[PDB]
Amino acid sequence: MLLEAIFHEAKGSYAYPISETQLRVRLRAKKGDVVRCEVLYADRYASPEEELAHALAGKAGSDERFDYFEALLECSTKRVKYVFLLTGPQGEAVYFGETGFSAERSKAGVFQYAYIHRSEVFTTPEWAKEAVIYQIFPERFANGDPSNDPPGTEQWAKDARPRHDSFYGGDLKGVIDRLPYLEELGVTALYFTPIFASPSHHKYDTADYLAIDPQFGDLPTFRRLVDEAHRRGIKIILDAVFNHAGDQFFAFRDVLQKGEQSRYKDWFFIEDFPVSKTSRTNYETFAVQVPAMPKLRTENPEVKEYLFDVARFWMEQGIDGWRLNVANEVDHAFWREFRRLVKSLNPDALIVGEIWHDASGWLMGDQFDSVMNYLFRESVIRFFATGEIHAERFDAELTRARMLYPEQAAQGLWNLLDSHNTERFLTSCGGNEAKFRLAVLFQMTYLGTPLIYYGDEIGMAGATDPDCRRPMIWEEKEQNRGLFEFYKELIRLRHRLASLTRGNVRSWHADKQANLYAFVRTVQDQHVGVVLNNRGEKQTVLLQVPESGGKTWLDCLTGEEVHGKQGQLKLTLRPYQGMILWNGR
Ligand SMILES: OC[C@H]1O[C@@H]2O[C@H]3[C@H](O)[C@@H](O)[C@@H](O[C@H]4[C@H](O)[C@@H](O)[C@@H](O[C@H]5[C@H](O)[C@@H](O)[C@@H](O[C@H]6[C@H](O)[C@@H](O)[C@@H](O[C@H]7[C@H](O)[C@@H](O)[C@@H](O[C@H]8[C@H](O)[C@@H](O)[C@@H](O[C@H]1[C@H](O)[C@H]2O)O[C@@H]8CO)O[C@@H]7CO)O[C@@H]6CO)O[C@@H]5CO)O[C@@H]4CO)O[C@@H]3CO
Numbered sequence: 001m002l003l004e005a006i007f008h009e010a011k012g013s014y015a016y017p018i019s020e021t022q023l024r025v026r027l028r029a030k031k032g033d034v035v036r037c038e039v040l041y042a043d044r045y046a047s048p049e050e051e052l053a054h055a056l057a058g059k060a061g062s063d064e065r066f067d068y069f070e071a072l073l074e075c076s077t078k079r080v081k082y083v084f085l086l087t088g089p090q091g092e093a094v095y096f097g098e099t100g101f102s103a104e105r106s107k108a109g110v111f112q113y114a115y116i117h118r119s120e121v122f123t124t125p126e127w128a129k130e131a132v133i134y135q136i137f138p139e140r141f142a143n144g145d146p147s148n149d150p151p152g153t154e155q156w157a158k159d160a161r162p163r164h165d166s167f168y169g170g171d172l173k174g175v176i177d178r179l180p181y182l183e184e185l186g187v188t189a190l191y192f193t194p195i196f197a198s199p200s201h202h203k204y205d206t207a208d209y210l211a212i213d214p215q216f217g218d219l220p221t222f223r224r225l226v227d228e229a230h231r232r233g234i235k236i237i238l239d240a241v242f243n244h245a246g247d248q249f250f251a252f253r254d255v256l257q258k259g260e261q262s263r264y265k266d267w268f269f270i271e272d273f274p275v276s277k278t279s280r281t282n283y284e285t286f287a288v289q290v291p292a293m294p295k296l297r298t299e300n301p302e303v304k305e306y307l308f309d310v311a312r313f314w315m316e317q318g319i320d321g322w323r324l325n326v327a328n329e330v331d332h333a334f335w336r337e338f339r340r341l342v343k344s345l346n347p348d349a350l351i352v353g354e355i356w357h358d359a360s361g362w363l364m365g366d367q368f369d370s371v372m373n374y375l376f377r378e379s380v381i382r383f384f385a386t387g388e389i390h391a392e393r394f395d396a397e398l399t400r401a402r403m404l405y406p407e408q409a410a411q412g413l414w415n416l417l418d419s420h421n422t423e424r425f426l427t428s429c430g431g432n433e434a435k436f437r438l439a440v441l442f443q444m445t446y447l448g449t450p451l452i453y454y455g456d457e458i459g460m461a462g463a464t465d466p467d468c469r470r471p472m473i474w475e476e477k478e479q480n481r482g483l484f485e486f487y488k489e490l491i492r493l494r495h496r497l498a499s500l501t502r503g504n505v506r507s508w509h510a511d512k513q514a515n516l517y518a519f520v521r522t523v524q525d526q527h528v529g530v531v532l533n534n535r536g537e538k539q540t541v542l543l544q545v546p547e548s549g550g551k552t553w554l555d556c557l558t559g560e561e562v563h564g565k566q567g568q569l570k571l572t573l574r575p576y577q578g579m580i581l582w583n584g585r
């Protein structure tokens with residue numbers, strides 16, 4: 001077996017505890033190269049003459065090129081030394097340890113996890129483990145208060161087509177009025193984009209981190225929404241824009257005024273004075289040359305404590321969490337501390353990060369709890385919407401992302417389809433509703449936290465920013481209530497099947513020819529199998545289903561009963577159909 005392709009490290013996403021006494025270990029190797037993987041272990045100070053405990057590493061999944069093996073280690077001592085025993089497709093065995101590969105357990109060495117401190121067990125909020133979040137872009141959801149509209153507000157019609165500077169009147173009062181709709185739908189949390197004082201319609205260019213923007217309301221109205229939402233089982237997550245401030249932020253303006261006499265010049269990255277008010281900025285900003293968004297020096301204690309107080313104040317209004325905008329561009333020390341402050345102020349406040357590349361650095365358990373799953377979106381787009389990838393590539397991409405981080409994080413990844421930064425999924429699907437629904441059926445049953453973008457639930461469409469930010473369709477006859485009900489039902493299933501919210505994932509079938517993909521979620525003795533006929537034609541499959549995990553399943557969407565004959569289940573699905581099979585346990 002190609003030894004150069006065998007990986008593992010006693011830390012990170014390959015070694016970590018899931019309790020003060022249990023260590024999870026994962027190992028990867030070239031696909032099909034290793035057939036069996038066992039973990040021989042013991043206490044670090046245990047005598048050489050003592051008996052080595054065993055542990056069988058299960059084949060947790062396999063992507064395009066790798067096989068992932070996973071096993072659990074019981075460590076009452078909270079200290080452990082372990083070595084792997086890999087067997088090839090032809091009896092060939094070999095030990096794998098910190099020293100290297102040897103046919104003699106001794107010469108291979110033995111990996112070590114020095115100690116499992118209880119304060120380092122990756123822990124995330126319990127409510128966020130089984131949530132369905134709804135993303136609200138305030139300016140475009142509901143105008144409940146006509147009196148606070150910006151000047152030049154355009155019509156709130158379905159044929160409306162926003163500009164980079166348009167305003168429609170969306171406010172917090174509108175949200176509050178819509179809580180019945182949100183509750184009917186079944187969402188358990190609402191993610192808001194920035195809602196703090198700022199001149200734009202997106203408000204990511206913060207003018208005052210301590211005041212709800214005037215066109216959105218006031219502290220009372222906000223407090224009111226938080227309460228009205230809570231009594232309906234709906235939590236509130238706000239968008240923290242800590243990487244940069246808007247050029248209206250008091251501190252920036254003071255610099256713009258007093259130049260390098262400013263008590264706040266080191267709160268930013270100023271290269272020379274005076275500070276530019278042109279198209280050529282002489283201060284660091286978000287992205288490239290974006291005058292309105294100067295970068296905050298979060299490394300500066302002065303700036304850190306301020307932003308931290310901004311956190312305290314909103315946390316004092318009762319919000320349940322944060323989504324950290326452009327988080328990968330602010331220092332780790334800030335986030336570790338931000339975590340200690342947040343989590344001490346409220347143990348159940350969820351911290352979600354927005355990173356557009358491997359986020360394993362912020363997902364060890366001492367910073368964020370999860371992040372936006374842009375990976376889930378790229379896989380879903382290319383599989384369901386554009387048809388650029390088949391069931392087997394889909395399976396792979398899905399699995400590679402699964403192994404990226406520790407389970408605590410993976411379990412809570414915000415699985416989105418689109419955002420206020422992309423074309424609307426239904427549009428990615430070229431208006432094809434059939435394909436659209438299958439993606440939702442998948443999103444609502446897959447591993448992670450499903451995130452619904454306002455309007456998708458009733459059929460809205462649109463190109464990227466700003467056409468994806470159209471005013472919400474509220475007139476019932478202009479809404480696809482058929483879809484609404486579809487969402488509602490799936491949302492009820494997810495809440496009802498513990499498997500769907502707390503189980504693990506395992507591929508079940510993937511025919512690249514038929515383009516049929518299926519997986520199975522499992523928690524304790526419950527099993528739920530999702531079959532997806534992602535093709536425009538009627539098709540028939542035979543899925544391998546040993547009767548140890550049940551010989552009978554029930555299609556949760558239709559109520560049809562299916563049975564296994566000699567360990568094989570034969571299904572027939574209509575074009576673009578998907579069945580959600582519960583094993584009754
Ligand atoms: O004024 C700027 C901008 O501010 C706000 O944007 C915030 C946004 O809403 C938050 O979500 C977050 O953004 C993060 C984003 O969500 C992540 O996906 C990621 O972004 C990456 C992109 O995904 C990736 O595509 C790539 O981006 C490249 C583009 O693909 C490429 O086309 C090009 O983009 C240019 C645009 O085409 C062009 O229109 C122009 O952009 C203007 C916007 O059109 C306009 O709406 C506005 O945008 C606001 C926005 O509305 C606010 O919500 O002004 C823009 C110019 O000022 O110019 C673009 C390039 O100059 O090039 C990009 C660059 O590669 O990479 C990115 C980054 O990896 O990360 C984002 C940051 O975390 O935060 C922002 C800011 O707070």
Ligand SMILES: [Ca+2]
Binds near residue numbers: 143148169
């Ligand atoms: Ca308004």
